Amino acid sequence: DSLDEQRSRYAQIKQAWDNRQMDVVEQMMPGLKDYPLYPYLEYRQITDDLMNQPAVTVTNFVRANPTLPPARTLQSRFVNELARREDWRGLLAFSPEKPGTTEAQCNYYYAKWNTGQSEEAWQGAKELWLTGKSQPNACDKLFSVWRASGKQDPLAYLERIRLAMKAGNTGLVTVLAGQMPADYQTIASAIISLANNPNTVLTFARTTGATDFTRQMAAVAFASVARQDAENARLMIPSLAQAQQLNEDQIQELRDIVAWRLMGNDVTDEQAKWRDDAIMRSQSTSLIERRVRMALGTGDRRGLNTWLARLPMEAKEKDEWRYWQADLLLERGREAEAKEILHQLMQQRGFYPMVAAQRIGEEYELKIDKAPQNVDSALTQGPEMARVRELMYWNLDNTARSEWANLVKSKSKTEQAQLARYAFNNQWWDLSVQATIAGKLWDHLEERFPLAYNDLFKRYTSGKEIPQSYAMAIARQESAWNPKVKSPVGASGLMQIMPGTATHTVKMFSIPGYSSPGQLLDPETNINIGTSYLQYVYQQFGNNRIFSSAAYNAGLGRVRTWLGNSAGRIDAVAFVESIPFSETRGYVKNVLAYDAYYRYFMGDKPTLMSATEWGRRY
Numbered sequence: 001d002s003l004d005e006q007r008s009r010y011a012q013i014k015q016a017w018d019n020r021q022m023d024v025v026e027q028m029m030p031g032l033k034d035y036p037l038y039p040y041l042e043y044r045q046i047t048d049d050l051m052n053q054p055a056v057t058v059t060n061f062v063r064a065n066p067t068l069p070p071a072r073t074l075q076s077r078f079v080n081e082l083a084r085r086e087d088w089r090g091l092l093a094f095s096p097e098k099p100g101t102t103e104a105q106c107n108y109y110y111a112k113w114n115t116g117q118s119e120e121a122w123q124g125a126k127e128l129w130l131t132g133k134s135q136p137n138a139c140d141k142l143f144s145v146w147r148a149s150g151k152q153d154p155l156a157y158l159e160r161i162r163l164a165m166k167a168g169n170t171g172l173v174t175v176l177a178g179q180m181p182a183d184y185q186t187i188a189s190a191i192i193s194l195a196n197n198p199n200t201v202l203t204f205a206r207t208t209g210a211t212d213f214t215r216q217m218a219a220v221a222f223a224s225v226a227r228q229d230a231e232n233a234r235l236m237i238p239s240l241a242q243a244q245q246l247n248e249d250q251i252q253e254l255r256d257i258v259a260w261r262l263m264g265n266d267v268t269d270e271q272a273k274w275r276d277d278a279i280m281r282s283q284s285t286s287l288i289e290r291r292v293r294m295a296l297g298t299g300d301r302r303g304l305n306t307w308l309a310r311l312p313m314e315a316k317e318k319d320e321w322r323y324w325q326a327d328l329l330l331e332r333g334r335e336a337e338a339k340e341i342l343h344q345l346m347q348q349r350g351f352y353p354m355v356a357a358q359r360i361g362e363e364y365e366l367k368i369d370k371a372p373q374n375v376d377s378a379l380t381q382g383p384e385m386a387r388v389r390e391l392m393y394w395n396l397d398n399t400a401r402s403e404w405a406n407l408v409k410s411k412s413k414t415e416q417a418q419l420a421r422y423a424f425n426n427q428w429w430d431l432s433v434q435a436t437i438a439g440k441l442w443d444h445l446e447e448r449f450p451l452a453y454n455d456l457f458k459r460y461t462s463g464k465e466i467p468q469s470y471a472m473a474i475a476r477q478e479s480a481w482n483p484k485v486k487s488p489v490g491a492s493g494l495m496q497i498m499p500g501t502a503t504h505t506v507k508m509f510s511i512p513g514y515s516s517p518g519q520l521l522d523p524e525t526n527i528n529i530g531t532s533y534l535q536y537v538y539q540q541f542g543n544n545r546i547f548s549s550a551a552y553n554a555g556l557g558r559v560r561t562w563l564g565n566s567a568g569r570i571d572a573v574a575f576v577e578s579i580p581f582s583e584t585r586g587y588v589k590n591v592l593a594y595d596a597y598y599r600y601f602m603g604d605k606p607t608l609m610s611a612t613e614w615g616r617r618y
């Protein structure tokens with residue numbers, strides 16, 4: 001027998017197992033005893049009839065298999081099965097220490113109360129209760145025997161309504177207030193009203209006693225009315241401060257809540273002066289920084305100077321703010337002072353280090369740390385590394401991921417450097433980037449920006465105007481080179497193409513044979529629909545990589561509105577730095593820099609922005 005024979009029997013046993021030919025599976029499994037991935041086939045057999053599986057069998061799977069990611073999911077999973085069974089004496093014997101999952105922990109503490117360890121159940125119920133996030137259904141039987149025990153503190157109860165309202169969980173607020181501790185039963189209708197309809201907030205304030213609870217409830221509802229109508233909220237602040245005997249620091253916070261809502265170029269000149277007053281009076285670095293960003297995207301050189309200076313000493317240390325202080329200093333004629341700041345920034349890594357070298361006309365120097373010439377045995381020789389080798393062979397990238405996480409996680413910065421290089425050398429490109437992140441090996445440039453899928457980006461950007469490096473830069477940022485990633489909200493694959501976008505792109509460009517979203521997990525299909533959407537977005541924004549990158553992430557239209565606000569008034573960097581969306585702002589900064597490292601590795605000059613990008617006005 002041999003590893004190659006073992007791979008055909010694995011593929012063949014998975015076919016029969018998926019088609020349910022259990023007689024063939026039965027026959028075939030004991031032979032696969034020595035294949036790296038046999039724990040997975042055992043895990044599959046066990047989870048296949050879990051409802052009538054004995055604790056002995058599950059306990060021995062877990063016991064022999066400590067480094068294996070699905071063994072841990074089985075603990076938390078069999079705990080809930082013993083809970084379904086109502087075997088509370090079996091659950092504690094199986095899982096003596098709390099499990100990792102929230103459903104599992106709820107069940108584990110309800111088991112403690114059923115086996116007489118009550119004060120342990122209440123240490124668990126209290127810590128599962130202090131949260132405005134809705135908990136598992138499992139947990140509802142814990143919290144009722146707790147509450148019924150008289151051991152539930154009435155403040156622990158009000159604090160969960162305080163946490164639920166802050167978290168936007170207006171539903172948990174209504175159930176919570178719905179069956180309430182008799183000590184607070186007079187404010188229970190007011191709290192349901194406020195959560196339902198926030199505009200009632202002044203009535204809440206002017207009705208209930210002003211305690212710190214009622215003030216925090218009224219503050220969160222207030223934040224909601226400023227979002228519906230900023231003028232309503234602005235004028236409501238004197239009555240609210242009165243009704244609740246609000247201290248000055250409390251009143252400054254109501255002003256910041258409204259100030260945030262008056263940041264457009266559609267607020268009345270009365271609103272603008274009110275706003276800037278509140279902001280000049282604020283202890284909030286974020287509100288002041290949004291304000292600097294407003295001076296920047298409007299070309300206001302005086303507001304920039306004024307507001308930049310109001311930033312806390314700590315904030316002024318940030319690369320962008322260090323760059324816009326040297327920007328203003330250069331206007332005022334203070335050349336040496338300013339070029340000291342741009343030469344120091346040029347010693348660091350990233351967007352502003354590169355913008356600075358470009359701005360004063362010097363060559364940016366890339367610092368690339370050499371990765372070790374030896375990746376010795378122990379790492380490279382284990383059990384877990386053999387499961388990783390196989391999982392990658394079968395393109396099981398997200399499973400390979402979880403196995404690599406455990407493996408790189410407790411080694412020294414040198415072995416994590418060897419592990420990156422090893423993966424780099426077997427062309428496991430997403431595993432190279434992961435070991436780099438994990439081991440924070442930030443100046444190991446080769447292993448962080450590997451030239452992945454070169455011939456396919458080559459091919460699919462040959463009849464297109466978008467440079468190849470800019471295409472690999474988008475993929476690098478989107479998925480960090482994992483073919484099978486799927487975002488929270490549906491974005492799939494190598495270039496993280498939304499389904500709705502894949503549909504419209506295959507229609508505009510008349511692309512053949514793309515029937516379903518799952519095809520977005522194929523490298524070549526994803527690179528074809530994706531480079532097609534990126535060339536579409538590039539050409540309608542005049543071949544400018546600032547506009548095409550923010551357009552691919554947020555869409556065409558949001559970018560078109562941002563071009564409407566600045567209106568020809570500002571420069572490239574100030575257009576980037578003033579994008580009102582944190583994700584898209586961060587996005588353009590990484591795609592522009594990453595594009596410079598792929599150009600460098602492809603042999604061309606790693607300059608951050610083209611002459612037509614740098615000279616245009618925005």
Ligand SMILES: CC(=O)N[C@H]1[C@H](O[C@H]2C[C@@H](C(=O)NCCS(=O)(=O)O)[NH2+][C@@H]2CO)O[C@H](CO)[C@@H](OS(=O)(=O)O)[C@@H]1O
Binds near residue numbers: 490491498502533557
């Ligand atoms: C390539 C692609 O599909 N791009 C789409 C983009 O995806 C973004 C969405 C984002 C995403 O999934 N972000 C994470 C969301 S979360 O924080 O994890 O919840 N990444 C994707 C590609 O970069 O979302 C915007 C918004 O509609 C779309 O613009 S619009 O259709 O014209 O309005 C745009 O077409």
